[PDB]
């Protein structure tokens, strides 16, 4: 009868918003404010920059990104204690009585 | 002349608010909403009930 719910797995999600940043230097490992709310997803990577990118120094740069994260579908997984759980049995006689 | 700023180390802080939670001592690993915002600090531990 009584379950209790442990876990939420989602099989599907979607993204939006999803800002990103890079410092360009050497100096610094870039940061972005929405990296604060863990509801976003974040990653650091490294690319490069320079006069084409326009800014500093000509090197392989740090860069970041984040995204809003929301899931439509789930798994409800629950557990039940070795209590109110019950079996139902039919114990049937032989001896005639048609059908 | 021109510097540029890389790093922020803080030598001191303070705490407040600071909610906490537990599920009961099998099913589940407890959760709390403010664990969301990484501006908080979080930890799991285990006690008993």
């Amino acid at each position, epitope marked *: *009868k*009584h379950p209790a719910t442990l876990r939420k797995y989602c099989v599907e999600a979607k993204l939006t918003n999803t800002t990103t940043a890079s410092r360009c230097p050497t100096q610094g490992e870039p940061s972005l404010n929405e990296e604060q709310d863990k509801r976003f997803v974040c990653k650091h990577s490294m690319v490069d920059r320079g006069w084409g990118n326009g800014c500093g120094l000509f090197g392989k740069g740090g860069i970041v990104t984040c995204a809003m994260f929301t899931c439509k579908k789930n798994m409800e997984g629950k557990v039940v204690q070795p209590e109110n759980l019950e079996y139902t049995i039919v114990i049937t006689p032989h001896s005639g009585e048609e059908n | 002349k021109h510097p540029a700023t890389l790093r922020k180390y803080c030598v001191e802080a303070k705490l407040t*608010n*600071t*909610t*906490t*939670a*537990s599920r009961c001592p099998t099913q589940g690993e*407890p959760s*709390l*909403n*403010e664990e969301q915002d990484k501006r908080f600090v979080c930890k799991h531990s285990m006690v008993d*009930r």
Partner: antibody
Amino acid sequence: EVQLVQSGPDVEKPGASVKVSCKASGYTFTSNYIHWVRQAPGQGLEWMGVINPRGGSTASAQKFQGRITMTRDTSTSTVYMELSSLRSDDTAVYYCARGGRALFYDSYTTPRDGGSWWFDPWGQGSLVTVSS
Amino acid sequence: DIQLTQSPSSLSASVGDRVTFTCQASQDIRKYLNWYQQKPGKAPKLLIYDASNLKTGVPSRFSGSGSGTDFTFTISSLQPEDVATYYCQQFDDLPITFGQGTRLQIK
């Protein structure tokens, strides 16, 4: 005495968020559970959610999933309910009240029960209207 | 999930009469049920807990009954100040839920 004073009625624009306060007195503010129950005028009672003064544990109903945050100030012995993405359906009166509480964190069934849900001293209610 | 049915939706009655309500549960709720009285413009109020029990400070004409899925609230003698809407409350499992309510009209 056992007492609850909620903040006064408010009106907001759709999609907004509103913050209603629940202050209590007459007991140990950490000794009872808090729940929020809403009543739409053309409807009966609906259970929004729950917060525990001690420690901060919380829970909410499926209907309001994603839409409602609960916090507290122990120093003031006060609870705060907040609803987000306000919509006209949200227009109703809100209520808060207590439970006689075993201890740490919030929600129990097996340990007997509270023996109410905003009916004894949940407060005086407060009206909130979502309108343009 | 747990669907609490309340009957009847409304009643009109003369003073002194005995009145009863019935709440039926989609699941066995055992002894967890409640009976509210609420007067208009007032917060709801306590009457019955564990389906069986008066609160202190509640008049004695009130009673409650029923066990597995089914329950009955009763006022022995209708009294005019009792005009209100009444409710029953399932606490079990905690997807906390109420009965739809029953209004009274004095005769």
